[PDB]
Amino acid sequence: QQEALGMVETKGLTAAIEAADAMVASANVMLVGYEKIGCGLVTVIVRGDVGAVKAATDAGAAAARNVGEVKAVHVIPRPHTDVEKILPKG
Amino acid sequence: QEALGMVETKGLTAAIEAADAMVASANVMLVGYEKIGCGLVTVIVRGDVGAVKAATDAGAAAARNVGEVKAVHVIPRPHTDVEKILPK
Amino acid sequence: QEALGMVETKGLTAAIEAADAMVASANVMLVGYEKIGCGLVTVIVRGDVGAVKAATDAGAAAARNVGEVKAVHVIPRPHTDVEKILPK
Amino acid sequence: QQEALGMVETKGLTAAIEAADAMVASANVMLVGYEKIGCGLVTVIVRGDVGAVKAATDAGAAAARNVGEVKAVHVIPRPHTDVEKILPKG
Amino acid sequence: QQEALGMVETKGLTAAIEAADAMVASANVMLVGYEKIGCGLVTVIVRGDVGAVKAATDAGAAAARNVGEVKAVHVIPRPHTDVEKILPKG
Amino acid sequence: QEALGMVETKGLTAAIEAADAMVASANVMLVGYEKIGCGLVTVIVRGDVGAVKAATDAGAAAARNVGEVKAVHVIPRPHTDVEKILPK
Structure with a gap:
């Protein structure tokens, strides 16, 4: 009953924006947000x-890798508390 | 009896995976995240x-497949009350 | 038709030079700056x-004489509306 | 007449929390606070x-060194303006 | 009709303050402000x-280089939108 | 006559030791701290x-026993009024 969760972490904001744009191509994937965590990540x-999230994160990481470095790609299919509990800030 | 568990990662994604696994792996409440620079x-x-002992182990393990784990530690009973010592 | 242009630099000064050149080099609106750590x-x-294609090229070129350029990229049409995907 | 001042600086928050916990074991030592200053410090x-502060900072650094790196341990026995003047934020 | 724009970027705040002080020696140069951008820059x-700005930035970079590292010196003689459009925050 | 003194350290603890010594070592007022990243x-x-000349020397000296000192400098008279040039 929980939505799935997709992450693409990049070094560089431009890569992350490219990633985000590509991920949202598919209209069934909602962009939760960005998080800066230092040293350009x-x-x-x-x-x-x-x-959808599986497909999107793959698409996003792919888009991104042509623009800057990709440090992580991961999908959590069934988050164990509410998505909001496990996230820090949209 | 009541305790504090930490998993520190380089990368947010590794930390989220860690958090999710820690909640999955035992009856433990997730206090929260803390950024401290350079992706940590x-x-x-x-x-x-x-539970916290089991969860932190599970969390670090999950996390290590996603990014780097810099620390895993349990404080079995915090010397001011369990959250007094946290800054968050 | 309508698009998004980025020039990422190490150094603020390089980014300001980049911005100035991008505005000079074509009919493009400057959305803004974003710091993301370690001088980026x-x-x-x-x-x-x-226009954005021409501007980003001009911007990166200007910038490279002042400091390091880490990325130059154009998103010709953003998949949520042009600013929806930006955090700023 | 001034209270003494104790510092333990660590790379890693977890080390710092371990440090803090150990330092406050002794009921005559008050924890002023944490300060993030970048690059995980x-x-x-x-x-x-x-x-007390002497004993605590030593205990804290000791606890901490098993969890992550310790970058400084120092005690200022008699701060020269008020503790509050010389500190930035609790 | 636009004022010119002068930048001196330093690694170290002390160098930047020395830079600023030197730049403002000449009463026809207004100090817009500082910007921290990470890693001591x-x-x-x-x-x-x-x-004036030409002379000041040169003077500033010079002053600064004796105190810490100078990462950039640049003058934009005729900014193309208003100075305020192209700047992030004074 | 009236002046500005700076000691830059890598590490907060070194900076606090520096500050304490500077106040101890002469009739000087402590303006404040500034974090600028990577522990500086x-x-x-x-x-x-x-006084400021003596204090900054004393401060840097104290500090060097605790952590790294990256800069020591005195501006004997600031060209806008003594605090105008500071950002704090």
Whole structure:
């Protein structure tokens, strides 16, 4: 019953924006937000159906890797508290 | 009895994976995140000593597949009350 | 048609030079700056695809004489509305 | 007449929290606070009787060194303006 | 009709303050402000007549280089939108 | 006559030791601290040129036993009024 969670972390904001844009191409994936965490790292987070999020994060990481470095790509299909409990800030 | 668990990662994504696993792996409450620079993020949980011990281990393990884990530690009973010592 | 342009620099001064040149070099609106740590600064502009393409090229070029350029990129049409995807 | 001042600086928050916890074991030592200063550095600060603070900072640094790196341990026995003048924020 | 824009970027705040002080020696140069951008980098910005700003930034960089590292010195003689449009915060 | 003194350290603790010593070592007022990233902290004092000169020397010396000192400098008379040039 929980939406899935998708992350793409990049070094560089531009890569993260490219990532985000690509991830939201598919209209069933909502962009939760960015998170700066220092030393140029930016984490783009998206919510949605497991398969969509899977496809989106892959698409996002792919888009991003042509613009700057990609430090992580990960999907959490069934978050264990509410998405909001486990996230810090949209 | 009641305790504090930490997993510190380089990368937010690793920390989120850590957090999710820690909640999944035992009856522990997720206190929260803390950014401290250069991509380091500290996930913190409260709960029963054994649960927290199991959760932090599970969290660090999950996390290590996503990014780097810089620390894993449990404080089995904090010397001011369990959250007094946290800054958050 | 309508688009997004980015020039990321190490150094604020390089980013300001970049911004100034981007505005000079075509009919493009300067959205703004974003600091993301360790001296990295991302200048962002909106406008017509070709203008933004020309501006980002001009901006990166200007900037490279002042400090390091870490990225130059154009998103010719952003998939939420042009500013929806930006955090600023 | 001034309380003494104790510092333990660590790379890593977890080390600093361990440090703080250990330092406050002794009920005559008050924890002033944490200070993040970048690149993972965190400074734990405590106030109290000179001897207590001496003992606490030593205990804290010790606790901490098993969890992450310790970058400084220092005691200022008699601060020269008020503790509050010389500190930035609790 | 636009004022010119002068920048001196330093690693170290002390260098930047020395830079700023030197730049404002000449009464026809207004100090816009500082900007921290991470990893010890600080950007001092000044506004004024093209020649003054030219002279000031040179003087500032010079002063600064004896105190810490100078990462950039640059003058934009005729900013293309208003100075305020192209700047982030005084 | 009236002046500005700076000691920049890597580490807050070194900066606090520096500050304490600077106040101890002469008739100088402590303006304040400034964090600027990667553990760098700049302690600033105002006062009589000679006092500030003596204090900054004393401060840097104290500090060097605790952590790294990145800069020591005195501006004997600031060209806008003594605090105008500071950002704090």
